[PDB]
Write a protein that binds this ligand. Structure first.
Ligand SMILES: [Cl-]
Ligand SMILES: [Cl-]
Ligand SMILES: [Cl-]
Ligand SMILES: [Cl-]
Ligand SMILES: [Cl-]
Ligand SMILES: [Cl-]
Ligand SMILES: [Cl-]
Ligand SMILES: [Cl-]
Ligand SMILES: [Cl-]
Ligand SMILES: [Cl-]
Ligand SMILES: [Cu+2]
Ligand SMILES: [Cu+2]
Ligand SMILES: [Cu+2]
Ligand SMILES: [Mg+2]
Lengths: 89, 93
């Protein structure tokens, strides 16, 4: 599937995480434009009662990705940009 | 004493950037009860919203990652105190 391809591309940016492990919850709202996350940060993203969390990978350069690539089932995710900061490692 | 503390808070905030207009901000962050931190870049201009009150800031260029309490930057934005802004290091160094 195209979903399998997308899942593979999303892996470049980290891995799904349990919600319990996030250090903050970001509410995904209409028109928010973007968020900023660090390499290694675990962030939960919430739309109503749905919550999906993610641990970002160690990026070799500052990069960005569409939240809808990482969490297509989260309402409102598509079009929100995630800027991920380069790893200090 | 409240007046003097207000004056030192403004000095402290000036170490972290400058007041900005909302028309130059690249995003508006809603400040909701319970919020603990947000991440901004050195140099980013961000507007912060509580209800329909919006206050914007341009973050300084920091030599290393640092944080500041948003309530010291914008004491008149209700709910700002206790939200910590994490400011990533500048690429200008
Ligand atoms: Cl948006
Ligand atoms: Cl953020
Ligand atoms: Cl859920
Ligand atoms: Cl990378
Ligand atoms: Cl970079
Ligand atoms: Cl998802
Ligand atoms: Cl926005
Ligand atoms: Cl640093
Ligand atoms: Cl502080
Ligand atoms: Cl203020
Ligand atoms: Cu590809
Ligand atoms: Cu950085
Ligand atoms: Cu100070
Ligand atoms: Mg950084």
């Amino acid at each position: 599937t195209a979903q399998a391809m997308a899942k593979r591309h999303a892996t470049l940016y980290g891995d799904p995480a349990g919600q319990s492990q996030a250090s903050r919850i970001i509410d995904v709202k209409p028109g928010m434009r973007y968020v900023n996350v660090d390499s290694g940060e675990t962030v939960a993203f919430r739309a109503g009662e749905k919550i999906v969390a993610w641990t970002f990978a160690q990026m070799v350069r500052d990069t960005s990705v569409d939240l809808g690539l990482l969490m297509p089932d989260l309402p409102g995710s598509a079009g929100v940009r995630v800027y991920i900061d380069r790893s200090d490692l």
